[PDB]
Design a protein around this ligand. Structure first.
Ligand code: GY8
Ligand code: MN
Ligand code: MN
Length: 178
């Protein structure tokens, strides 16, 4: 037990993120103490989802990620039976009330292009928005949903996470884990 990566995750992300991520890993049968790199990834993805939903107007995004699996499905059925939008096969991350699309957020260490395709195969009418620790983004139909500055905030934070990891020599292990 007790890795540097796990102690870094707990000091780097805020407590609400850390425990939402722990709960999700355990819910899906994984242990944050052993799979510490994936622990970092989930918290990162989580924080991006929250920053993303703060990017729009006050009540534009519905957050699906972070909820327990059963409640997350309850709200998207509500969203579907209220929007006449088709029920996705897999849980997405947000719902955009303004543009009436579900959103799948992606946070890749690998190459932006390859990640989007891989995420596209899982499919096929929900919007996809990928961010990288390098500062590159790709979005379905070249529609990036939020304005430049809200997206720029997310990329700034991703690169800060990279640096803090690299400053502790954890970046190498994290990069080659995905
Ligand atoms: O909803 C998702 N997972 C649910 C299912 C699941 C499983 C374990 C823990 C939480 C959740 C919740 C979801 N999963 C992924 C990837 C690919 C499938 C597994 N996985 C991760 O464990 C993950 C990665 Cl590698 C990086 N960041 C966040 C996460 Cl959760 N990527 C997303 O973008 C995304 O939304
Ligand atoms: Mn998700
Ligand atoms: Mn996602």
């Amino acid at each position: 037990r007790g890795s540097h990566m796990e102690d870094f995750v707990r000091q780097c992300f805020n407590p609400m993120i850390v425990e939402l991520a722990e709960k999700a890993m355990k819910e899906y049968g994984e242990d944050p103490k052993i799979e510490t790199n994936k622990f970092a990834a989930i918290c990162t993805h989580l924080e991006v989802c929250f920053m993303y939903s703060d990017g729009g107007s006050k009540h534009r995004f519905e957050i699906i990620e972070g909820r327990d699996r059963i409640m997350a499905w309850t709200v998207v059925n509500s969203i579907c039976n209220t929007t006449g939008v088709e029920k996705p096969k897999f849980l997405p991350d947000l719902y955009d009330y303004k543009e009436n699309r579900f959103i799948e957020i992606g946070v890749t260490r690998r190459e932006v292009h390859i990640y989007y395709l891989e995420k596209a195969n899982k499919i096929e009418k929900t919007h996809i928005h990928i961010f990288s620790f390098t500062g590159e983004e790709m979005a379905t139909k070249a529609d990036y949903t939020l304005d430049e500055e809200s997206r720029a905030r997310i990329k700034t934070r991703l690169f800060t996470i990279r640096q803090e990891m690299a400053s502790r020599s954890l970046w190498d292990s994290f990069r080659q884990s995905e």
